[PDB]
């Protein structure tokens, strides 16, 4: 779950198998022209550091 640290939970590095919710929320790009921003909350891996 997202709202805690360890919100990314990838199994082993011999795979890219995981659980991906870090509150990664795609949103509109800057100035109304193409690219994919990843808007990621202060959550795991940001907050509590």
């Amino acid at each position: 779950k997202a709202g805690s640290f360890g919100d990314l939970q990838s199994r082993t590095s011999t795979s890219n198998d995981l659980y991906a919710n870090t509150n990664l929320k795609l949103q509109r790009p800057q100035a109304g022209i193409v690219h994919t921003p990843f808007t990621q909350a202060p959550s795991g891996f940001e907050r509590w550091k």
Partner: protein, 351 residues
Amino acid sequence: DLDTHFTQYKLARPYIADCPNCGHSRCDSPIAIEEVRGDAHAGVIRIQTSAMFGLKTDGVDLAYMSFMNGKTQKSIKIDNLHVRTSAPCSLVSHHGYYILAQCPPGDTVTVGFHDGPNRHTCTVAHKVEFRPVGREKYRHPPEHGVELPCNRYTHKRADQGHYVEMHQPGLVADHSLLSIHSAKVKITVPSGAQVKYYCKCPDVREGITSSDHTTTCTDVKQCRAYLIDNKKWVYNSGRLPRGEGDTFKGKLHVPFVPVKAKCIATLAPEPLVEHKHRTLILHLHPDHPTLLTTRSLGSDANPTRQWIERPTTVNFTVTGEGLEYTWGNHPPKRVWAQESGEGNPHGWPHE
């Protein structure tokens, strides 16, 4: 666009002016920046150069660059220009004396094309602020949320819906105009004008003008190199004075009006609406600061104010005519009060 708007173009000339952060003793900047407008709700920022880039003065193309060097234009490619604000801009379009350029907001604006030994720039101060409309208030969006109805500027050059007072391509010195009347300084017209003038020596110093000339005092620097143009109109600048001899007060539009479109705007996910008996439990976990507020309804106003920028469970006591819950500047949600969790009597607010 490039069709009709010869209102500004034909009946104007770019005007050479001056700027403080330039030259060896201040360059004359024909790109002198007045009237920065990041004042909208947008993401695109409007700058006014003194220069009339756009059409040269001709019919076509917003991607030429006509500033004033001399009394004459200097109608060249726009590839030497650098619009910037407080981050490098990419021009969107120029129209009139006004350029729209895509860049972040900025306290200053900093424009400049290389020319001379110096890099020939011009800068100016003006307090600028964008915001997404509503609850979530920012200086411009962070990079997140939904788009929702606030002011923003268009791609295209023509974008009318306002008008500024225009006087003329007013009084500025152009000493390329100023010939000599055999030892005294002689003003000439830029393009047809009643040219305002005085020296320490007699004439009219109010700027009541019907082609003032003072050719009585020798020095060019002891006289008033001023230009009331009498069939032309350009943006009113402080670095372009006006007179009163044959000045216009004629309002003539501004292109690059921030107009109602879908502005880049804000909203942070995870409202997580849950209701147990007359209460909205709300786990919250935003990407970026969300101004939450509610109204437990009735004659009751019940405000709430809280910026939420990190995980917090809040609650809002739903009532007999509901509550609404407004997670950011996105529109109100709605909720009936009553127990979830099975099995009761019903049929009154008493059971």
